Design a protein around this ligand. Sequence first.
Ligand SMILES: O=C(O)CCc1ccccc1
Ligand SMILES: O=C(O)CCc1ccccc1
Lengths: 396, 396
Amino acid sequence: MFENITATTADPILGLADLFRADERPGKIDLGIGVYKDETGKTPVLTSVKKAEQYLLENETTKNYLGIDGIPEFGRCTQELLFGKGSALINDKRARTAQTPGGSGALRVAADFLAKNTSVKRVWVSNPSWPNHKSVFNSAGLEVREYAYYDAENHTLDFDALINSLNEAQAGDVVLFHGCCHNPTGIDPTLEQWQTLAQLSVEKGWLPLFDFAYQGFARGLEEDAEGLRAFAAMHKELIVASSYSKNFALYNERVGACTLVAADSETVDRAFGQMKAAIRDNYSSPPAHGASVVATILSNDALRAIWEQELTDMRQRIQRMRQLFVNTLQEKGANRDFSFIIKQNGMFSFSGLTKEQVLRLREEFGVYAVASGRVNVAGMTPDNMAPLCEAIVAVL
Amino acid sequence: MFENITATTADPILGLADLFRADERPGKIDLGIGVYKDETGKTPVLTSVKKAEQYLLENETTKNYLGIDGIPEFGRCTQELLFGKGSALINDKRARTAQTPGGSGALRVAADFLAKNTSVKRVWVSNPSWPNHKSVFNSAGLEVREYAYYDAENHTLDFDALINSLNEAQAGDVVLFHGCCHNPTGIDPTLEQWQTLAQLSVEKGWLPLFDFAYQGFARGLEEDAEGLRAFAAMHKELIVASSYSKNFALYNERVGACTLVAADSETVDRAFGQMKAAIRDNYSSPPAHGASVVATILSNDALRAIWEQELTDMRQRIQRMRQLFVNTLQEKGANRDFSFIIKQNGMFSFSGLTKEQVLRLREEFGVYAVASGRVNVAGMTPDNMAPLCEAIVAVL
Ligand SMILES: O=C(O)CCc1ccccc1
Ligand SMILES: O=C(O)CCc1ccccc1
């Protein structure tokens, strides 16, 4: 049965770790997968996470199965982060949260739930795009269409092209939005743009799906949720697939959430029953450790303030690497204006490298960016900056 | 888009956790979900597990993503536990293991893999079966057929009927076997029957899939793997969905494995690529914490001797409860001979109780069993035995 299985296209991002590891060039540099690094080029455990885990070591008395939807206090903390403490969504009990294995898990759960229980047939995603969106949604039998998003001459959100692109999108189509730190462009709608989009989505009868993996990385926790909250103020229904992988540097514990919102409690509770059925046929119930850490941190005043400052330190270091990055490129002999890189949010820099230029950075310099030309600014340090910028300049 | 979604109960068995929880009667007894309890009626974290978490707290330096297939040492330890240390499957590099969130996650991964990459159309499952086998495989678009298994008269394998009912299983069909402690019946093939079954499937051209969640709970670690290894010795191709939820009392950390076996190394690597693609389309990569614990324990000599003793203590306690259970059924004047229960492997007794008797147990006595009549013997203590036995006696 297995002799004739055909090999797959390597994943443009995930496949990068093996290719990087196998490269024998001394001085190779990994700017691929979006993991935050410190000044030393390490990805450490957060001290607030270590404190929470020590707490769990001392105090946990069982590993008994969580509910299918996970730790209740986790869902409750997720909803405050997403919607704001005194939110009308929370007071009206209009939202149900399933703790999932990562925002990835939340995406797949959303996709299965929608394919099995609704009339949804397509999801609209942005180009440039995050590859797993089309992969996850297609696997659940959903068709995926692209909307336009980016002006590549100006390195700007092309707002009219976004809207014109979606003239197409019908009532009961899903439209996917990145809550902040658009992956890969780093360009986000303004508040006013978020409000226009929200109003258009209501009028068009779209079902909004927010992929929210970077809360805290654009401007800060509350300001990063403005876009989502503006959609939340307008809509009877939406889904949020959120992650704690990046904001807690908890990548490998797979901590995320699928939040369902509907017009009232009755409806959301009833629809959430079928979300649980979608999880049943998948991984059955979610992993306790990472979510308990996040719930422990978010529930304790003192721990939370420790985490919040760690998060801003992460964000400030990336801002510093972005200034250093555009400065070093100039100094290494790039003509070009690269100031547009300073105003991209999140972990990445995106300009306009072709696949050919990316492959050359790799073969010739051992510098690994993603096939799309996306570079991990958060993987840059004062020590790799010079060789990495020299590599980039040579391929321009 | 959500208003017409219909009320449902998701997982029937996990659904019992809630039914049990919401019940306000103080003498309620839980005999549903297969979770081990100690003498005090608690589900403690294992000492070996606490020791491992302690080590991890003290020594982990990163939460950077695992590879799609998880911790390499976890994979190694799994295949050794599965196939034996000297195995030709290991030396010949014919097996690839992905760490998954539970054996449940492994079943889903296996099903998507098959649905997507092979011409497998149907999966044959025992009668009776674990309920989630059917819904998992159906969710991936695979027909599920039933084979004869349990002789509900002799409380025995109806082996000849099993072979008759599999006559129509075609070359390239999947046949699902439980590695040991068949759930729910507690009746496993003998080694000789396993050997007959291994011969037949080679002859018939079936793809065997093993659900192996109870290694160590029938007779012991190596003894329980005998059926699997008799299949491994004969087959070109094979899939194992194994779990550490029960043997490490680690239910909520979601620790399992999907093992793929093919004829040679090139074949298994090319197909495993597509297994990785099925995971990428799903939760992307598995949770580190639980599997780290298991890898920590299995690769350190003293730590694993502590674990094996704890597992021995779990099995030995269950057997003492089985004996106490039939004896006190008798003493309470039971109107059927329940000595057949002594012969069942694992955590359960499949007792022959009807749906009516199950509902009356729940309603009159606050004793909660699975609707099939399966009761969790591992949830029985000396303290709850007499009340639960008077309950069963009254409904017979
Ligand atoms: O590099 C990224 O885009 C973020 C990390 C990631 C990559 C692929 C799947 C899940 C998370
Ligand atoms: O009770 C059982 O059959 C074992 C525990 C379990 C139940 C449902 C999903 C995963 C594991």
